[PDB]
Amino acid sequence: DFSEDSDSDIPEKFTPKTDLFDYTRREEMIPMRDGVKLNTIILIPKGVQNTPIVLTRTPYHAERRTLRFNSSSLSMVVPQMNDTTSAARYIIVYQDVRGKYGSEGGYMMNKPLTGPLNTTGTDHSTDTYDTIDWLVKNIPESNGRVAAIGGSYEGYTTLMCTINPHPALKAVVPFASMVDGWMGDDWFHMGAFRQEASLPYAYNQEATRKNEIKWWSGSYDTYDAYLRAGNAGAMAASRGMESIGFWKKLAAHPSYDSFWQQQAMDKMLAQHPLTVPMLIVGGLFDQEDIYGSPKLYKVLAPKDPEGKLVHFVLGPWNHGQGRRDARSLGPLQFEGDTGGWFRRNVMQPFLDHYLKDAPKLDIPRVLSYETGANAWHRYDDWPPEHYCDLYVQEDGKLGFEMPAAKQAFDEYVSDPAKPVPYRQRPTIPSYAAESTWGEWLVDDQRHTASRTDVLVWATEPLKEPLRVAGQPVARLFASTSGSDADWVVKIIDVWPDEVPENPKLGGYQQMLSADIFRGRYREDFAVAKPLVPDKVLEYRIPLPQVSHTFLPGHRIMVQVQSSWFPLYDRNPQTFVPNIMFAPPESYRKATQRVWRTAEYPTAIEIHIIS
Amino acid sequence: FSEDSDSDIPEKFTPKTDLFDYTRREEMIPMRDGVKLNTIILIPKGVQNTPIVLTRTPYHAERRTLRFNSSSLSMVVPQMNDTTSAARYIIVYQDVRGKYGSEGGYMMNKPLTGPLNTTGTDHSTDTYDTIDWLVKNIPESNGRVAAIGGSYEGYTTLMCTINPHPALKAVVPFASMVDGWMGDDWFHMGAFRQEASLPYAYNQEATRKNEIKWWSGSYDTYDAYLRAGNAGAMAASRGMESIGFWKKLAAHPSYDSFWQQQAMDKMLAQHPLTVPMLIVGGLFDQEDIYGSPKLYKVLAPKDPEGKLVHFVLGPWNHGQGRRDARSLGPLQFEGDTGGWFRRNVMQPFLDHYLKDAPKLDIPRVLSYETGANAWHRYDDWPPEEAHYCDLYVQEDGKLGFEMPAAKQAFDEYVSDPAKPVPYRQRPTIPSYAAESTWGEWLVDDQRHTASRTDVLVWATEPLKEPLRVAGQPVARLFASTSGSDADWVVKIIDVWPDEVPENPKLGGYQQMLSADIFRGRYREDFAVAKPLVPDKVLEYRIPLPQVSHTFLPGHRIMVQVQSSWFPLYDRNPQTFVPNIMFAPPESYRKATQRVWRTAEYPTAIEIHIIS
Amino acid sequence: FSEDSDSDIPEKFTPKTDLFDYTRREEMIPMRDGVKLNTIILIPKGVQNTPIVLTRTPYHAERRTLRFNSSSLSMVVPQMNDTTSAARYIIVYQDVRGKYGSEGGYMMNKPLTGPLNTTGTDHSTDTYDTIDWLVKNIPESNGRVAAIGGSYEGYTTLMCTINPHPALKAVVPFASMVDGWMGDDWFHMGAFRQEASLPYAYNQEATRKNEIKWWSGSYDTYDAYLRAGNAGAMAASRGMESIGFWKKLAAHPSYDSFWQQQAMDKMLAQHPLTVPMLIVGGLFDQEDIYGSPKLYKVLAPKDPEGKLVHFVLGPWNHGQGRRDARSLGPLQFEGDTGGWFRRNVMQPFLDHYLKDAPKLDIPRVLSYETGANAWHRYDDWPPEEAHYCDLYVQEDGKLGFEMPAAKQAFDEYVSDPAKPVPYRQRPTIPSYAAESTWGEWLVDDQRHTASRTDVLVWATEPLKEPLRVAGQPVARLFASTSGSDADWVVKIIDVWPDEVPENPKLGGYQQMLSADIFRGRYREDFAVAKPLVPDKVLEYRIPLPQVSHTFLPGHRIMVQVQSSWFPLYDRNPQTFVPNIMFAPPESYRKATQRVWRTAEYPTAIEIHIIS
Structure with missing residues (x-):
């Protein structure tokens, strides 16, 4: 039918050929209780029925997160954090949080729970309940059991799954989580503003829904650029960030006032019942969220006096090494792949016990890697x-x-x-x-x-x-x-x-x-x-x-x-x-x-x- | 603004560009058939009566004009435009018909209107309508335009010389696509380049904005293509039956009327040669090693006195004529031959025809001899003697x-x-x-x-x-x-x-x-x-x-x-x-x-x- | 040979060198006072009536003539001798008095016979006695000799010009040691270069053949020299009290009569200028930045007609003038500037005075301008205008x-x-x-x-x-x-x-x-x-x-x-x-x-x- 002398070479609708792939990529717009639809990517391994779901809620493009490499193999498209779950042939789900990329609605940086700082009627916890309820009812290859894993912001959303949790949620694995951005996580460290870690981040993540406008630069050395500006306000103004919501919040709340106090995840989770088993994974050399994970165990451990739910893991990792390979960090060399060893020997047996009724591995309350001596204790x-x-x-x-x-x-x-x-x-x-x-x-x-x-x-x-x-x-x-x-x-x-x-x-x-x-x-x-x-x-x-x-x-x-x-x-x-x-x-x-x-x-x- | 309900993302955000040393104009120029082409115009701040340097690309004009996300004009343009940016030219990049930001249908290396093009428009008519709009709507220009570019952008540069707009004063086609069957991208004397053809046709033609890209099941391509057996089974394994250029490649394996009518050397030989041309070829061009010397061979007898055609043959791979070229693998050349050519030969060539600058005595042929490491x-x-x-x-x-x-x-x-x-x-x-x-x-x-x-x-x-x-x-x-x-x-x-x-x-x-x-x-x-x-x-x-x-x-x-x-x-x-x-x-x-x-x-x- | 008792190592072993394109002649030449100097003469095979290029070194002549352990002369000679090897010159390296294979006492940069040298011999007398032997005992020689070298080898090259042998026709001193106090190796306007002086004096003067080398107890030299407090405590920590050049440094911290009478620029200025000189200096010489420009300054008015002295200032570090110099750190120059100088300037200079080849018009001052990347x-x-x-x-x-x-x-x-x-x-x-x-x-x-x-x-x-x-x-x-x-x-x-x-x-x-x-x-x-x-x-x-x-x-x-x-x-x-x-x-x-x-x-x- 095609005419070589007039017709366009590009077909009206192209669909990639995926029958040789060992997984099915199901893309869905799950409607929330307020009608707003969230872009959800479901990766179902072929040749499996009644398998658990591993869920990650991200503000960093779910369609790119589930495409590490453009491959026909499920083990190649998933992030390194999902290596053990991919090998166990779990259903792997990545969802764009409200207001980001493919998802509808407005975006609020680390949207808090419904209350004085959230009058929209929905939050990450309500959005998770509506998502899990749809997945356990509309994915026939699932066993009706869901777990939530993720790092940093994906760790923040993982913690939000534990508030008024859906009965299908069986366990959570929050890696290097965003707990208190003012006290010592991403935006401030005891009041001292992280201008380099906050301003370009807010620009890229909040100028557009799909990060179509990115932070421009006039100098290779950032030391010279930020010094010439004089203060953080002038650097934000030089990029015209006056209309950026998170910059408005940062500029209006420089102190640890009610805005930051009510948002502290360790304070919030302590004021809520603890029912979801938790595997807190922190890094000793985390250059982004060094406060989060240890503070999380400190306030959640007395709520679990024995050790039936809360577990804390502290490895020799930078911000993302707990979710990937970690044989070394700069000139320091550790005894093998500590990150890979953790996920295969601690995280996967933890998940398989609550999701597939596998034998419960004896995990200590605290699993710490001692640097210098190079040993897990x-x-x-x-x-x-x-x-x-x-x-x-x-x-x-x-x-x-x-x-x-x-x-x-x-x-x-x-x-x-x-x-x-x-x-x-x-x-x-x-x-x-x-x-x-x-x-x-x-x-x-x-x-x-x-x-x-x-x-x-x-x-x-x-x-x-x-x-x-x-x-x-x-x-x-x-x-x-x-x-x-x-x-x-x-x-x-x-x-x-x-x-x-x-x-x-x-x-x-x-x-x-x-x-x-x-x-x-x-x-x-x-x-x-x-x-x-x-x-x-x-x-x-x-x-x-x-x-x-x-x-x-x-x-x-x-x-x-x-x-x-x-x-x-x-x-x-x-x-x-x-x-x-x-x-x-x-x-x-x-x-x-x-x-x-x-x-x-x-x-x-x-x-x-x- | 309410911190408890309002979205942090503004409805419409416009970046602050008043501290940039250039202005970025994005225009949807309507062609003679009403179809609009995405055109990115970069004007240096404070400049007036300066020429235009045009490049027509199927590789995202908005990305080509953003080498680095910078406030400096020198940092956003491809390295090819380093001398034109320093001379404070107006730099223009346009999405070709049917690609990325542009409207219309996309035909791989769309030929001139005739037996292989019944749409009514082609790259030369689209170029004429683009140049006419540019010289009429950009007041900072002197009304003079030059077209430069390599590979596909070199092919579009050659198409500017067919029924040229009177404002087009010179062309610099680098490593151009001339004959895809004889010895350029798709075949070399009949031998099919499956690795260079199939992933490229897939990426450029599955979608308008390259949203669907070639997937892999093996790191070593040798293993992948051998297991497929033939090029057809590799294309069928990716579901390329609906991709237009693959249908053309499979239907025309031999040098038939389809390929003979599209040969740029044979086509340009049948048309008047009026625009000054600086043909830039590379000795080690791994993609278009046939095109540039064949272009000089057919266009040199059309210009006996050597008034319009010049041939430059450097020690370059496919992209080195448009960037730095001090070395290539283990081979080391005498300085940055790429940068030397653009500053000392290409820029004085352009400055003479676009700014009435003194005419540099450029030879008929400028050849770099490897081993001896000297320009002749x-x-x-x-x-x-010979x-x-x-x-x-x-x-x-x-x-x-x-x-x-x-x-x-x-x-x-x-x-x-x-x-x-x-x-x-x-x-x-x-x-x-x-x-x-x-x-x-x-x-x-x-x-x-x-x-x-x-x-x-x-x-x-x-x-x-x-x-x-x-x-x-x-x-x-x-x-x-x-x-x-x-x-x-x-x-x-x-x-x-x-x-x-x-x-x-x-x-x-x-x-x-x-x-x-x-x-x-x-x-x-x-x-x-x-x-x-x-x-x-x-x-x-x-x-x-x-x-x-x-x-x-x-x-x-x-x-x-x-x-x-x-x-x-x-x-x-x-x-x-x-x-x-x-x-x-x-x-x-x-x-x-x-x-x-x-x-x-x-x-x-x-x-x-x-x- | 008995497999059950005899040693596998033969009493005397001679390497098979008849497949080599050069002959290695090793001699112990007696000086006027009877002291013998170890001289290594490399004679290219299949050549007669060829000049001699001499280098006098305190850095092991047998090791200098073995860059690589090879059968080819072009592979055993230093990169400095790349053009003289290709021209098939006789390449000679000699151990200076008191070092490695040579007899006699060692005096660091032994000055001419005078108030600072009462031994009766110096580098100029030892050179005269050496050249006289080489021209009378090498049949493959044409009777003409040139002296080339860098740093200390540049200092000995400068000494060849004092009361020179009739056979010395030209000298090429690179980054020469001229004034160790004013601005060369030991001091820069009084500021003592402890890191450059103490390990060097220890390695070169503890033994004749450098058998005892400077030991270390710290990777970071900043901490080691700071813990010592002063240079004297650092020299005492290695037991350098008996090391002669350290005694001289410690006793002469100021620019007194010891350093004043050893200044090569002041010494050569009060001597006749007869030997054609090609001064080769480097803009970024981290060892002898003062020497070469100071030589031209004091020797240029002695040659107003410009028939003997030539100054060359390249974009080179201390050793780059004698080897490949395409870049320095992040700086990138227009090709191998070092190799370009030796092939196009140094070799035609040597061939004119040694083989009567046509004289190349070498400018008085040949300077490489950085940034612009051009030889002037x-x-x-x-x-x-200036x-x-x-x-x-x-x-x-x-x-x-x-x-x-x-x-x-x-x-x-x-x-x-x-x-x-x-x-x-x-x-x-x-x-x-x-x-x-x-x-x-x-x-x-x-x-x-x-x-x-x-x-x-x-x-x-x-x-x-x-x-x-x-x-x-x-x-x-x-x-x-x-x-x-x-x-x-x-x-x-x-x-x-x-x-x-x-x-x-x-x-x-x-x-x-x-x-x-x-x-x-x-x-x-x-x-x-x-x-x-x-x-x-x-x-x-x-x-x-x-x-x-x-x-x-x-x-x-x-x-x-x-x-x-x-x-x-x-x-x-x-x-x-x-x-x-x-x-x-x-x-x-x-x-x-x-x-x-x-x-x-x-x-x-x-x-x-x-x-």
């Missing part, structure tokens, strides 16, 4: 069942001896015109093709150790191995000549002078645990308060979890600085109502002093285990 | 100037279609793959085929003095097969010395220099497929890709002959079938191949040596 | 041609010797390490120091038009310190555009172009150490390495000032001490530094701008 609690103070001392020393001094302090000048680069320049966006953003938390800290606007303390080389576990807390007694200040505290494992197993790692200042504190929230996280100039004030800074052995020949190091640019916006070092729109005149040099006396003993509070 | 000014291609001689295949794997004796002599091998010779070392992957080295393949080390028993090898002794070659080598092959069909692959190789002090890792390197394939069924007529007489010594004329090279002292000249180049080319069954696209499995049989070297049958490479 | 023929260095301009440091981190009118204006920083500025990003490793990038350190990105509070930064706005600079930039620094001693590091940087279309990963790249350090105690006189006046504005004249550069549009000109460059240079205590080599730990104190920019004190970079 079965623990009853986190931290496991001595607390010690590691004091900053004179001549750049770090030790367990309490200073008996009357007036002793270490001094440096912090200049906002020259902020300390969080990494060696050029600094590039996390999504750039040549980005090592995933390896930044194990970065060598020697580039800052030589700086005059950074303080350094270190122990003598250790003769015997030292084991640390749990959460270190920095008891910082510090003074500033200004009326505001950011306080960065880093715990570093200094490798020996010479390393026989890897010579080029000699003297390597490996960052182990580090975090920032915006001083204006010292007395109250909800109310921004000015600091008294030259006055010595006490700071309580809990740092990311540690599960490490400081091996013999290694040193324990502490580094203190007043900036971490361009990841965090600069503190002007003079009090302003909102640092998002701080005037250029407010950015001024300040004399910073870390005190170490009997009255003011600055130290790291660590759990040492034998 | 030539009056013709090949240059006319001498055209024969390089005879000899006994004991020798290659020399000595003519063969009368006595019976030949080299024998068995070609097994169940074990086709891989065109590259395995695993073979598609050209678009992230880790693909498809652009470097024409300079591959041929040592992997040299030790194979289903491959014939001949080599000279190490040269004591340099040997210079220029022009097109022609293989005069006298060969017999025990089958009724055969493919004949002829390769010219520069064998690097045993030890190389400049780069030790390159010792013994059998660098491919000029190679092509001939489908034996088209020995007497390219338009009609005829069977080969079994065991009969038959003569083949195989013209090979252009050369401009110095075989340096210590180097050897090598000739390799084989009967398969898989999976890039589909296998010849070695038994005559009406259509090799749908050849049944029983037709694929082993054959005894003989390359004869006697006084009566002197197999040789006809090369043009220059002093 | 100049009549003098710097070229004569004018001297002042590039003033200004307020708000600005740099411009506007002279300040302010009465009180300066930029302040605190220099902390406990935290010295790392000369490179850590870990800093020795130059001889396998993974070392020591050769690319002068083109290092300077953004790591730009954000530091103990570093001052000034930059122009992006250039609208290109700015060409040539010759030697001189830093006229007006600075004060709260201490009584200081080091002043002045850096000239080419800031690449915010975004680079040719190479995106190079956006914002603070490329170092020309930089040097000045030891403050020598402000008024290099020969005597003098304390600085605390809190007083003092004038410093700091000549910086040669420039031949075009600051392209979009690029910025940047100046950076700091007080340390560790561990390459030892720390200035910042309090006056008699000898910094043995400076006590309590002498190292923090100091408030100020760079003034007033009408009375206008700190600027004196640059030669050309049209």
Whole structure:
């Protein structure tokens, strides 16, 4: 029928040939209780009947998530997180959340449950119930049992499935979840705004439904671009983000007010009954959500006194390594594929027990991978069942001896015109093709150790191995000549002078645990308060979890600085109502002093285990 | 705005571009039939009375004009437009009819209105309507336009010269699609390029906006295409029965009226030559190695005084003439030859015809000689001191100037279609793959085929003095097969010395220099497929890709002959079938191949040596 | 041979070398005082009446003539001898007196017989005695000799010209050791290069044949040299008290009579110029940046007719002039500049004076201009339109041609010797390490120091038009310190555009172009150490390495000032001490530094701008 001299070569409707494929790709627009339809992609393996469903709710294009590679094999199209479920021939379902890509409705960044912050009548929990109810009734190859798994935002939606859960939901696996974006997850770390992690993200995810408009750049080095803008508000304005909803929310709520308090997932889940078995999967070097997963176990563990529901896994992983291969992270090398080992030996037996009635594998309450020693440990609690103070001392020393001094302090000048680069320049966006953003938390800290606007303390080389576990807390007694200040505290494992197993790692200042504190929230996280100039004030800074052995020949190091640019916006070092729109005149040099006396003993509070 | 209910995504978002050094104008220009074409106009800020540089593409004009998502004009344009962007030209990219943002139907390389186009419009009429709108609606322009582009964009550049708009002042066609059957993208002298054709026809023609893309079931393509058996079963496994260009490829395996009427060299020869042309070809172009030299050959006699036509032949692969070209695989050239050509030859060429700038004395032929690493000014291609001689295949794997004796002599091998010779070392992957080295393949080390028993090898002794070659080598092959069909692959190789002090890792390197394939069924007529007489010594004329090279002292000249180049080319069954696209499995049989070297049958490479 | 008892190793073994294209002749030539020097003579087979190219080295002649263990002469000789090997010259490498295979005592860069040499022999007498033997005992020789070499081999090449043998017809000294105190290997205007001097003196002088080598207890040299405190404690930690050159360095920290009488530029200026000289210098020489330009400066007026001295300044690091030089770090040049110079300039220069081949018109000054990427023929260095301009440091981190009118204006920083500025990003490793990038350190990105509070930064706005600079930039620094001693590091940087279309990963790249350090105690006189006046504005004249550069549009000109460059240079205590080599730990104190920019004190970079 085709005419070679006039007809278009492109057919009116093309349908790819998928009869040689080992799976069926079912695309559906499931209507919610308010009539709004959500784009749902259902991957049913061929040759199977009565198989469980593994569900993931994503704001990152379900049709691209279920197409890792353009392949005829189900094992090749699914994300690496779904490797064990694909091998077990589960039904794999990816759904676009309300308002994103193929799904209808409006979009609200991490849409909270119905209440004071949500008056739409629906939320992620109601949308999940309507989705699961349709899947268990309209997929004949299913056994009527559903599980929800996912990382970061997909981990946030996974946690939302447990609120008023559908009877078909049997278990959840939330990886590196978004729990509290203000306290220490994606947008802020104890008040300090993550301008680089928030602004391009909000632009790409909220300018259009289908990410058709993406963040433009005028400079390869982001350090220079964010410094020239002066503040986060001017960078957002330079991209015309005034109409972007999440930027409106970020600019209007810089403090831990009612908006962030009511959204805290750990606070929310504690105020709800716990019935869905949970496998909390966290990473020690998670550069995006290091606060989420351990805080989640801390408040959910007393709700499960025995251990019939809540399980916590803490591996040596960056943000996404728990969901993929993890044999190494930067120059650190672990004992085999830790990520692959976890999903095959812990996650799949966990899922198969609640979804296919398979024998229940004895999983500990806490499964922690100890770095340095390179071993998985079965623990009853986190931290496991001595607390010690590691004091900053004179001549750049770090030790367990309490200073008996009357007036002793270490001094440096912090200049906002020259902020300390969080990494060696050029600094590039996390999504750039040549980005090592995933390896930044194990970065060598020697580039800052030589700086005059950074303080350094270190122990003598250790003769015997030292084991640390749990959460270190920095008891910082510090003074500033200004009326505001950011306080960065880093715990570093200094490798020996010479390393026989890897010579080029000699003297390597490996960052182990580090975090920032915006001083204006010292007395109250909800109310921004000015600091008294030259006055010595006490700071309580809990740092990311540690599960490490400081091996013999290694040193324990502490580094203190007043900036971490361009990841965090600069503190002007003079009090302003909102640092998002701080005037250029407010950015001024300040004399910073870390005190170490009997009255003011600055130290790291660590759990040492034998 | 209510934080408790309102959608965070605004109804209409417009990016902030007032701090950009350029303005982006997106226009749906209506053609003479009412069909609108998506046109992306990039105007440098503050500029006035500047020319326009137009490129017509089937590869997403909105993506071509966004190399990087930048506020700088220098960063958004393809590297090809680096000199035009620096000169502050208006850069325009338009989606061709039926592709991406444009309306209408899509016909693969849509030919001129006539027996193969009854729609009423073609690329030349669409170009005329586009140029007319541009010079009338862009006030920053001086009313002068030039068309530049490579491959398909080179084909559209050539179509601008047919019934040209008076505002078109010059054209720069790079590595253009000229003859898809004779030796460009789809076939090489009848041998079908299944790997370059099937995934490309699928991706560009399944949907208007390339929303449905070629799927894979195997990493190694060699394995995938061999298991399918023939090109037809590979196309049917992807459900390509409704894709128009596949229907054309399957219905026209021979060089019939369909391909003869579409040959750009033959078409442009029948039309007036009025627009100045700068033909840019590459010596190692892995996609369109036939087009550019054939274009100069047919258009040079139409311009005797050398007023409009110029031919540039660089040491480039398919895309290197339009970007940086300091090296290609292990070969290292004297600086960025790509950037050197655009800044010193292409930009002064354009500036003269578009801004009345002083006329640069560009030669008739600008040829880069490999080995010697030097650009030459030539009056013709090949240059006319010079001498055209024969390089005879000899006994004991020798290659020399000595003519063969009368006595019976030949080299024998068995070609097994169940074990086709891989065109590259395995695993073979598609050209678009992230880790693909498809652009470097024409300079591959041929040592992997040299030790194979289903491959014939001949080599000279190490040269004591340099040997210079220029022009097109022609293989005069006298060969017999025990089958009724055969493919004949002829390769010219520069064998690097045993030890190389400049780069030790390159010792013994059998660098491919000029190679092509001939489908034996088209020995007497390219338009009609005829069977080969079994065991009969038959003569083949195989013209090979252009050369401009110095075989340096210590180097050897090598000739390799084989009967398969898989999976890039589909296998010849070695038994005559009406259509090799749908050849049944029983037709694929082993054959005894003989390359004869006697006084009566002197197999040789006809090369043009220059002093 | 008995398989059950006899040793498998024969008493005497001789390698089979009759398949080699060269003859290796090894001789112990006696000097005028009876001391024998190990000489390795490589004679190409099948050649008579061919010249000799001599190289005198303290770096194992038997190892230098064995680049690769090969049967081909082109494979055993250093890349420097690639053109002389192809021309089939006799290549000779000799161990200098007291090193490896040679007899006698060893004196580091043994000066001519005089107040610093009472032995009766020197490099010039040993050369005369060597050339006389070679011309009388090699029958394949034509009787003509040329001396070529780089660094120490360049220093011995320069010594061949003092009272030269009648057979010496030409010299090609590359990146020569001229003045180890002023700005070459050991010191740069007083600042001691501890990392370059101590491991070298240890390896070259602990034993005759380098059998005992410098040991290490730390991967990062920054920490190791900082823990030592001073250079003296570092030398004591390896037990270098008996090492002769260390005794000389420790006893002569200032530019006294020891260093003054050894300056090759001052020494050659008070000697007749008879031997044709081809001075080969590199723009980015990380070892001998001072030597070669200073040689032309003092030897050019001795040859006003330009019939003997020629200066060549390429875009090369220390060793790139003697090998392949297509790039340096992220910088990319137009082809192999190193190979281009040796084939087209050095070989025709040698063949004219050694084989009577036609004289090539070599310019007086042959300079490669970076940025523009072009070789220029100049009549003098710097070229004569040209004018001297002042590039003033200004307020708000600005740099411009506007002279300040302010009465009180300066930029302040605190220099902390406990935290010295790392000369490179850590870990800093020795130059001889396998993974070392020591050769690319002068083109290092300077953004790591730009954000530091103990570093001052000034930059122009992006250039609208290109700015060409040539010759030697001189830093006229007006600075004060709260201490009584200081080091002043002045850096000239080419800031690449915010975004680079040719190479995106190079956006914002603070490329170092020309930089040097000045030891403050020598402000008024290099020969005597003098304390600085605390809190007083003092004038410093700091000549910086040669420039031949075009600051392209979009690029910025940047100046950076700091007080340390560790561990390459030892720390200035910042309090006056008699000898910094043995400076006590309590002498190292923090100091408030100020760079003034007033009408009375206008700190600027004196640059030669050309049209």
